[PDB]
A paper describes a structure:
Captured in one pre-contraction and two post-contraction states, each structure fashions six proteins in the bacteria-targeting baseplate, two proteins in the energy-storing trunk, and a collar linking the sheath with the membrane-penetrating tube. Specific attachment of baseplate tail fibers to receptors on the surface of a target bacterial cell triggers conformational changes of the neighboring baseplate, which leads to reorientation of sheath proteins and contraction of the entire sheath assembly.
[name] data processing of the post-contraction diffocin particles resolved two different substates, an apparent transitional state and a final state, which is 2 nm shorter in length. The four-layer sheath near the collar only contracts partially in the transitional state, allowing for the tube to be extended an additional 2 nm in the final state. In the transitional state, these sheath layers are partially contracted, as indicated by the gradually decreasing diameter of the hexameric sheath rings from L28 to L32. Specifically, the diameter of L28 in the transitional state is similar to that in the final state, while the diameter of L32 in the transitional state is almost identical to that in the pre-contraction state. Consequently, the last few sheath layers still interact with the central tube in the transitional state. The N-terminal domain of the collar subunit binds to the tube, while its C-terminal β-strand extends towards the C-terminal β-hairpin of last sheath, forming a three-β-strand handshake interaction. However, contraction of the diffocin pauses at collar-proximal sheath layers prior to completion, giving rise to two post-contraction states. The observation that sheath layers on the baseplate side are fully contracted, while those on the collar side are partially contracted, supports the wave-like propagation model from the baseplate to the collar, and our structure of the diffocin in the transitional state provides atomic resolution details of a intermediate of potential relevance to other Gram-positive CISs.
Residue numbers in the entry:
A (entry chain V): 254 to 354
B (entry chain M), C (entry chain N), D (entry chain F), E (entry chain A), F (entry chain d), G (entry chain k), ...: 3 to 142
Write the structure that this text describes.
């Protein structure tokens, strides 16, 4: 929240390239969090396809003849939609051992 | 599934060099050459190989619209310092399944072309390079 | 017996790579290069050779429909581990006497092509490889 | 004596391999390469040579009607045993003076082609070999 | 921004050699070849290179209007003294963004062509050279 | 100044060999190949070269009107004596600025062609040579 | 059991010297040379040997990134005190099973390279040594 | 941390001899060879060594621009007095961090090259020497 | 100051032997080897040296145009008298500044080559020698 508020709200134009740059910044922050071993190293960030499609449908444009790649970069006004996938580590609390006599 | 329209066309590519989009681009190519050594194992006729590393190579060809390549490295080369660049290639064909983007890092160029022209011939400049690292972005 | 229609056509082939059928295939080629040493035997003018082993080589060329080749080996190559695959080629021409099928094993690829495009030209990707073993399935 | 019609045509040849007639044959070639060493003799400017031996080489190209070449040597090569064959070539043109026949012995092949096909192209298989001995039968 | 007309054409170039304008010029080319050594660093598969220097090469091709090339170096070469020249190339296309000018210094030529003619063919003379230094003047 | 008509044409040349004019001449070419060694000077990236000498090379091609080349050297070569000749080339085009003449001295020929003919093809003989010295006569 | 991939690669090795990691390592080698005295026993033809001791030898080669070796021993050599070090080598190939780590103790170097460079050549330093004792840490 | 660019290049070095800069320097080398005696200690298998002293050796190679070496020592060698010199070497690569400067004192040359030349070969002079003491000035 | 052209070339040298110019000279070399004794001084680690004298060595290589060396020494060697000669070497490169001329006195040859030839190889003669004194004439 602090990173987004400091440098992105109101200072960039809502284009596809700026969205990609913001995605890169978030991914870089997650990779920085990686080295401290707080979460897992499989984190991915990308455009929230379904939310964007729902918003476009609400605005009235027809998506029957729109390519899947075309929907990603279509205009959304001021709104931006993103999604991520991270895995959070936990401490050792249960242990199983089987010694074969 | 497979159809003729799905094949990507090179007219739809674009290239960013050092964060600046290059509009006068003709072709872009990157490749990785693996290093493998032959190993003969007793009792088997077929030879087997062991992989040891890779080497990256490529080139850029672009129309001679402006003297872009000089301003990058011309003065730095004489002094003895070699710069490293980052290139991004995006291939976005409307017919194909989306687009693929790749970042090629640690690029070092092989040569610099001061002047090349001939009467009755349009000008072109091609520059080969070598790299070490790469990323995958929005692969299909 | 022999007739023109009996000759096989390449349009009727197909290729399975790692258990997944590849539809955008242009050509497939496999070969085995024997190793022979010259030996001169006293009293005979004609030189004779001794067979010592074989080496397997081949290549695959396919249309650039999708980024299939990256997902296989791109991340594994950097880490230092080399994967091995299995390919099956089937050639089934209705006019010829049935079909022949061959399995090529222990395939290791020679290079990886990150990007290759040019304005006004359709995209293609060719990848050479080396193998060690093979089977015969439904040979004519 | 000499006339255009007397020239032999390749359409009229035929080839027997291991006692079985091969009907899908495109071309056949055999040759002997002599080995000669330069010798300089005092008092003479012109260099003279001494003949020491010969090496036999050739190749066969045939339409890919059937998987004949595999059944001969495919399984034997892996085990470590090399077979030897005998080929007979006959060239019988009605216009020329009769026919000439030659037997090429102790044939050992150079490589085996598991698969080779491309879309829109007819299949062909070429196999080079080396030999040691030969006979003359009904030479003109 | 990018447009077809912006591409520079070779018809609009001109070349000054030793302070005298050369009007019968067909093409002019200069290039710098960097010297790089492969370095393998423990723990990384990708090979990296170290830049050590550069070598300059080029050539000039011009119509055989007059015996200009002889008067420069013909008598000096025999005596044992090698001259050094300076060349300036200017490429000024009205459609493109202005003009670029480059001075190539310390030029030493590779060969001298005494005579070259053939019946029914116009005469041309091409001379390659090597250089060491360069300046940028009015680069775009 | 510069105009199309000023370019010299090869049809207007002529050649004197050993004081006798050769009328059946197709082309004549002479060149001087300098010898240069790379020298690396501490503190400078650009490599520099040192000139050490030159080598002369050329060739003559002429129609096979008569057996001129045999009578010159055929008997002398076998005995062990090598002759040296002098050639003069004159290029006189009415449109160009006058004519240029050059004498090439100490010519020694590389080979002798005893016979060369083929059915349906006109005969030609080309002879390469090497020289050491030259003069300038009426240079433009 | 035996596969080509199991062979260790030297790119994956790393070296510690006096507890500080040496990233600029090219090659490492440590060897133990036994001492054996010839013994002849009366009544038997075959000559036999007796083992008496061993001597340890080795060498380290590294790029000339910094002046590491000077600070280690240069000042102490002049005074008369000979330092002793400990080296640790680990060879961890991902394809091979297990990594071997060996400690070499009581090292004494043979020489110090104050300065060595040549124009157009990258710098490298190599230093042989002798040791006395070793130790096994997680051998395969 | 470790990068290919950090490797020092010998092109950027320079040498001072007796306070006069030597611009015609090709390569410089200075080495210190220790003296060690084998010591066998009863009760332990491994042989140990004792350090006793060092001997310094080196050489200088330079182009034959002028007769620098003659004026230094030629006259004094005949009389019987052996001069002693001081050499300073600095290696300053812009890509590497820091430049190392070392002074080599009490130099005595091994030989004097009066004359050495061959046709078609550039001239070079090399001279080995031995020294006694060194000094560190701004090591990395 | 330092330029590539300043390097002396061996093609421009010439040699006088016993007052007669030697035009058939291939290479010349004269060297002075010092004699030094190791001296160990108590209290200091570095070994030092003492200079005692010098020995002169050299060789001359020349083409086999004539029998020059026989007439010089052949008859006197049998009788028992050993002749002594004087050689003068001058190296005058037009590009370099100044020419060095050195006289080598009291020459004694090591061997005489009566005959040495092989078929298809040009003849050459080389003869090493030792000298005692030298002299400087117009050193640079």
């Amino acid at each position: 929240r602090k990173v987004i508020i400091d440098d992105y709200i109101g200072k960039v134009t809502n284009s596809y390239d700026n969205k990609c740059l913001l995605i890169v910044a978030i991914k870089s922050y997650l990779e920085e969090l990686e080295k401290s071993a707080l979460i897992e190293s499989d984190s991915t960030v990308e455009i929230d396809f379904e939310a964007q499609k729902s918003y476009l449908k609400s605005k009235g444009v027809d998506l029957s003849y729109m390519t899947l790649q075309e929907i990603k970069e279509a205009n959304t006004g001021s709104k931006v939609f993103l999604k991520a996938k991270i895995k959070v580590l936990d401490a050792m609390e249960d242990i199983d051992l089987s010694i074969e006599i | 599934n497979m159809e003729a329209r799905n094949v990507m066309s090179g007219t739809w590519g674009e290239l960013w060099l050092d964060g600046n989009k290059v509009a006068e681009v003709k072709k872009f190519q990157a490749k990785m050459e693996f290093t493998k050594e032959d190993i003969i194992i007793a009792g088997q006729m077929g030879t087997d190989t062991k992989y040891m590393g890779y080497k990256g190579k490529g080139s850029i060809t672009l129309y001679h619209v402006s003297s872009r390549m000089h301003k990058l490295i011309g003065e730095k080369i004489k002094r003895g310092s070699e710069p490293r660049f980052v290139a991004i290639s995006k291939l976005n064909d409307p017919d194909s399944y989306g687009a693929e983007r790749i970042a090629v890092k640690n690029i070092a160029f092989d040569d610099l072309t001061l002047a090349d022209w001939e009467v009755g011939v349009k000008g072109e400049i091609e520059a080969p390079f070598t790299f070490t690292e790469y990323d995958f972005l929005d692969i299909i």
